[PDB]
DNA sequence: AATTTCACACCTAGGTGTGAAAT
DNA sequence: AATTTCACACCTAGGTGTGAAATT
C-alpha cells in the first residue's frame, strides 16, 4: 500500500466545494466539471493496473435549494438508490509506468438521471449528494477472472470532490464559476 | 485459418484505378480512405496483437506529367525512412474482442519529417507505398500472419497531382464538404 | 524549377448554459 | 410548485483542400 495519488486542479475543486458543488445530470449523459484528474506515484512499473471510478451517496437525504436564504436544506428522505454503475478508465488495463508517465484524467466520464441507461454512464438521483471515489486495482492479465481481495486494491477519497447532482443550477455563484473556468462555456463570458 | 475483409473495398478500388495519392505533412496527416478491416476465424479465448506497417512498392522516385496525365519514373528512390513498430491502440486483446466489431486505424498519421517523435509513419514524398496488416497470436513463452491488399497501395505526396484524386477526396471525405459544388 | 509549407475558411463532432416549455 | 427537458447559439477541438509564398 505504497501507492500515492495527487488530485489535480485542487484549488478549483476547493473553490467549488466552498460554494457547494453542483453537477448537471441529463438523459444523454453530462461530463463532470471540473474533470476528475489525478497524478500517480509509487506504482510498480512492470505491474498491470486497472483504474476505476465509483460514486457513493454522502447521506440518505433529498435536498432543496432555498433562494430566499441562498442555502441547501433537507427536502425529505432520499429516493431509492440508483442502479450501481462503475467507470473504468478507457486506457485500463495498463502498466504502472504508463499510468505514472502523465496525469490521468477521467474526461470521458458521463453522469445521467436515466435509471434504464445502457451507455456505461453513471446513474445519479437529482437533488442527492454524492462522493466520487478513485480506485487503483492490481490485475494479472494471464488470469481470465478478477475479484476484490484486501491486498489487490486501494481507494482514494478526496472530500473536496463531493457534489449535489442537479438538472439545472440552483446557486447562481456555481453557474458563474462554471462559465468563468470551463472553456466550453466561453460564449457566456462578459 | 484467420480471414480478413477490407472495409470500403469499392472506395479503395475507385481510388486505385486513378492511382491513389496520400497527403504527407510535418504535423501528420490521416489516410483517406481509412484502413478498416473485419476479422474472422480467430480463437475467442486467445490473445492477439494487431499491427500496421508500410513497405515500399519499388525502388524508384515518381514524377507526375500534367501533359499526359500519368506517373513517370523521375529517378532512383531516396534512402529508407526510420521505421518503428506500429500497434493498434487496443492491442493486445482477445480474439472475441477483435471479431466483435470492425477494426480501424483512423488515428494513424503519415509524415515526411525524418525527425518525428509522435509515433507517426515516416514516408518519402513521390514514392510508392504498400500498407500491410499483421495478426500476431500471443504465446506465453506460424503465429505471425500478414495481409496485403493490393488496392490500398498509394503514392505519398505533399500536394495532389491528379485533379481526379482531389475530386474523389472532396466527394467522399466529410471533412472536405466545404469544397463540394 | 518542381515541390513543399503556411495561414486560412469551412467543414464535422461534440461540449456549454439559456430560457422557454413541459411535466 | 419544483423540477426536468428541449432547441438553440456559441464555444472548443481538430480534419479538409486552397492558393499564395517559400525553398538543403
Swiss-Prot record, chain B:
Residues 11-181 bind DNA. It comes from the Eukaryota. It is found in: Nucleus. It is linked to Haploinsufficiency of the TBX1 gene is responsible for most of the physical malformations present in DiGeorge syndrome (DGS) and velocardiofacial syndrome (VCFS). DGS is characterized by the association of several malformations: hypoplastic thymus and parathyroid glands, congenital conotruncal cardiopathy, and a subtle but characteristic facial dysmorphology. VCFS is marked by the association of congenital conotruncal heart defects, cleft palate or velar insufficiency, facial dysmorpholgy and learning difficulties. Binds DNA as a dimer. Interacts with DSCR6. Interacts with NKX2-5. Transcription factor that plays a key role in cardiovascular development by promoting pharyngeal arch segmentation during embryonic development. Also involved in craniofacial muscle development. Together with NKX2-5, acts as a regulator of asymmetric cardiac morphogenesis by promoting expression of PITX2. Acts upstream of TBX1 for the formation of the thymus and parathyroid glands from the third pharyngeal pouch. Required for hair follicle stem cell self-renewal. Binds to the palindromic T site 5'-TTCACACCTAGGTGTGAA-3' DNA sequence. This is T-box transcription factor TBX1. It comes from Homo sapiens (Human).
